[PDB]
Amino acid sequence: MTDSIMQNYNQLREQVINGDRRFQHKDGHLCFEGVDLDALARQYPTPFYVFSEPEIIRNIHEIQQAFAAHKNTKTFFASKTCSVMGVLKAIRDAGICAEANSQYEVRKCLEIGFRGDQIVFNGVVKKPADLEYAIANDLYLINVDSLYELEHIDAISRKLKKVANVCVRVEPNVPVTAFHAKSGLDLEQAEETCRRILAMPYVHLRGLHMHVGDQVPESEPFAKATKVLVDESRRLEEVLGIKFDLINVGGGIPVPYKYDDENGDPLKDNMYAGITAQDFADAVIREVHKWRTDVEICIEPGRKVTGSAAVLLTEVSCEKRKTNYDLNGNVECHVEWKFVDAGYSVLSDSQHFDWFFYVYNASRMTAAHDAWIKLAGPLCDGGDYFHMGVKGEEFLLPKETHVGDIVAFLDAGAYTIESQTVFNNRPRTGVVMIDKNGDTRLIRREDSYEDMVKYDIYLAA
Amino acid sequence: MTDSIMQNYNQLREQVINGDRRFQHKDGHLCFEGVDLDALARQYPTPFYVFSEPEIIRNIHEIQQAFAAHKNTKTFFASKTCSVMGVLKAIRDAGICAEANSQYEVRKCLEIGFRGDQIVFNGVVKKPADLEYAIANDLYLINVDSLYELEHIDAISRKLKKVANVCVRVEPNVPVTAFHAKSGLDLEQAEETCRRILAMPYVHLRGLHMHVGDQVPESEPFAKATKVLVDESRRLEEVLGIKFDLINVGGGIPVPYKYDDENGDPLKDNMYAGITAQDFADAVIREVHKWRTDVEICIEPGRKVTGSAAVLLTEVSCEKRKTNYDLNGNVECHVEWKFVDAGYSVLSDSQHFDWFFYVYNASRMTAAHDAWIKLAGPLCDGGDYFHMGVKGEEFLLPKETHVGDIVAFLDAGAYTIESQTVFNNRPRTGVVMIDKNGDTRLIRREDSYEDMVKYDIYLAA
Numbered sequence A, B: 001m002t003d004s005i006m007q008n009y010n011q012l013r014e015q016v017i018n019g020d021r022r023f024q025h026k027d028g029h030l031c032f033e034g035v036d037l038d039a040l041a042r043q044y045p046t047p048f049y050v051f052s053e054p055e056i057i058r059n060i061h062e063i064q065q066a067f068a069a070h071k072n073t074k075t076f077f078a079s080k081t082c083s084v085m086g087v088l089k090a091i092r093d094a095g096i097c098a099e100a101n102s103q104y105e106v107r108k109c110l111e112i113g114f115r116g117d118q119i120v121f122n123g124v125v126k127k128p129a130d131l132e133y134a135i136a137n138d139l140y141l142i143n144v145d146s147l148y149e150l151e152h153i154d155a156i157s158r159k160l161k162k163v164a165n166v167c168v169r170v171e172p173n174v175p176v177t178a179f180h181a182k183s184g185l186d187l188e189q190a191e192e193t194c195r196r197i198l199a200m201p202y203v204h205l206r207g208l209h210m211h212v213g214d215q216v217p218e219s220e221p222f223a224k225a226t227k228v229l230v231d232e233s234r235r236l237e238e239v240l241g242i243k244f245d246l247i248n249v250g251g252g253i254p255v256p257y258k259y260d261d262e263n264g265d266p267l268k269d270n271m272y273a274g275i276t277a278q279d280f281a282d283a284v285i286r287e288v289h290k291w292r293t294d295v296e297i298c299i300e301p302g303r304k305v306t307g308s309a310a311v312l313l314t315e316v317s318c319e320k321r322k323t324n325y326d327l328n329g330n331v332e333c334h335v336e337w338k339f340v341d342a343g344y345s346v347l348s349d350s351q352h353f354d355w356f357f358y359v360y361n362a363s364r365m366t367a368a369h370d371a372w373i374k375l376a377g378p379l380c381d382g383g384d385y386f387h388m389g390v391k392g393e394e395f396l397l398p399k400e401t402h403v404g405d406i407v408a409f410l411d412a413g414a415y416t417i418e419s420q421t422v423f424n425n426r427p428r429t430g431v432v433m434i435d436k437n438g439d440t441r442l443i444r445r446e447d448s449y450e451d452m453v454k455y456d457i458y459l460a461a
């Protein structure tokens, strides 16, 4: 039944407002950490993202508590996930470290107050200028992704007379890695690469690195890949006569985007989280401890830190009914279109990666969501509507939904800011933060008109 | 054979440098309008796009010549395709008009020198502020996309005491429109919508509008949809006792992304252009002339104006070989990975829309492209490699390819600039223009570090 789908969705809605650590209701409205989101969306122009420092902290706690059995664990937030400076500041103040994915990511992490010894710099294209900047800033780790890059690390560390601290990335063939994995070295190359680093005067080998993937719905991939890295670490300690400082096992802890696990198969629909942080930690720690209990384990969670910790707020800005008629002029069906002021230039993964986010009427959060609608964005593009619905391409909202109501997309905190575009010269969005005291502030402005053209060089008028 | 695929690709390569109006060779390098692109990519940091004003002009000529049988044709470049100010200036100087897709697009078109009477403003979400700005600027057309929006057009035109010039967008059900087309009104709503506009004191009804789609590989959709709009225009002239100024038939003229038409089926692979501008014009004009030969026809080409008129230049910045071994340690296959400094944050449609672009070694353009390689970008994302290869996910480059060589992606002028992101805080690219005299200048800067953080509000260090 669609009645059953509708019943289930309204049970989920009730659980948001009565059963979720993040949310409440007041005045008929969805609240996030006590902040009425209808009211918030009248103080700031839509569309915008609102982050929760309290929920970031809760997510970091899940991660760190998961690793309680291994004291020497170091946690580096994968800042490609979200690098708005106030988001990075909340993460730094919560007591963890940072992983960076470009020269400018390294620089902004340093600027917001991560120390060099709290930063890992990873990449497949680390040009001489990138490596010089990283080495000059005494980073905790720079990964070694290829033999070509390693030659630049040797030459530049020598030039600067500064030790480059490295981890060698090895991507295991776990049953095709050569064809589908661009990153890292082959297992077969690890020994000679490590031997060569040991002989370099200004490069310090700290350990091996891997990263399995993103939104991983099973523990086995982590266990099998970690075992490969652990076995090679153990073997190289013996062969080379060294003791590694660490092992870096990467990220990939999933986040629930659908919550009714009893109705989902995570291996078929990875919007269902197939595993928890505790499952990830159990797999990793168990494998590492077969080698050493004292070695440092570095992890690089991205999505899990911020994914659940933001909402996208977008105003219903237009509506229409489209009707299909048969050849005799009789109605075949009606479609109720609701247009919000955010499209895929604002929420890119909803279009490009078939990503599901819960959608509710934040202005009518206590009302039955009892009408099937299609949800469109504002871009001049027939494809700019939200295809990942509750049932096919259809969403559920109260039949009473009105232009002016605020729609919320939940779990909108990972990979949603830097992926925005200025397609159609709609601006990239502002971003608001709810701090630990429940107070709000703007942490990113909406792009202005000046910002659309300030990059261009042209004869003025 | 893959030998046959390789032979065919090298025949295409030879045709680029001996048989293409845009390109030549010099010093072993690809040249665009006489500009050596290897040399250009040493003067400006990669990756960057280079546009050709001469090729934009040639494309506009194709379009306008296609409409020679209808004198009263007005051509509006769909500026969502590319709105870098120097690109818009070239289009304005070539003598055509502009279609705009947001308030800021309208504003930049006015700023670069399109007059109000040369601008169409389209949209599904035209908020009061957008409509007020458009009406105040005396635009040639503002489309009417819904009854809800029309109420704002009436109220705001009355407030300003300024006539709003409109075209009513009608999306025909051509064998599901209600379910798949968010834009426009139903045919069945056109009569009453027009009747109501006629009665408004400050709204001027000019005609009907449609837009079929993008990269359309057959003429029939245009002919059938145009006939629907023409038949309803004729009928409403009679019923309402009026004479329409115009009919706006939209865009969608395709561009060839693969050129060996003898080997392609455009209905299965629409990288093959299934039709030319002349085919589009023949379909449209034939249908309009069954009603009136004097009425103005408005067209809204986007992709066809700029698609063929840019190249993305990107340096080979790293390389590696990955090898799959069997359980006995014997080699199963090798993969030669070449890493360029542009990934899907720079060339978004290569990832998100399965878009093919020809790829050549611009530094070795006269050398046989005789080695199968995989082409990766620089993002820290396993999916950031180019999947739309010559054969599956494999490309062809000279075996002699070296780090430092410049790779060119052809046909990179449509939907490639505003769709860029700062994912991983890699900057959005600079843009260079080759003018009519063959001289180059920077028309957009690369985003600087300041630009990564200038939008953020945070406590300084």
Ligand SMILES: [Cl-]
Pocket (backbone or CB within 6 Å): A073, A074, A075, A076, A095, A096, A097
């Ligand atoms: Cl830590």
Ligand SMILES: [Cl-]
Pocket (backbone or CB within 6 Å): B073, B074, B075, B076, B095, B096, B097
């Ligand atoms: Cl014109």
Ligand SMILES: [K+]
Pocket (backbone or CB within 6 Å): A197, A198, A199, A200, A201, A202, A203, A204, A205
């Ligand atoms: K060493």
Ligand SMILES: [K+]
Pocket (backbone or CB within 6 Å): B197, B198, B199, B200, B201, B202, B203, B204, B205
């Ligand atoms: K009127």
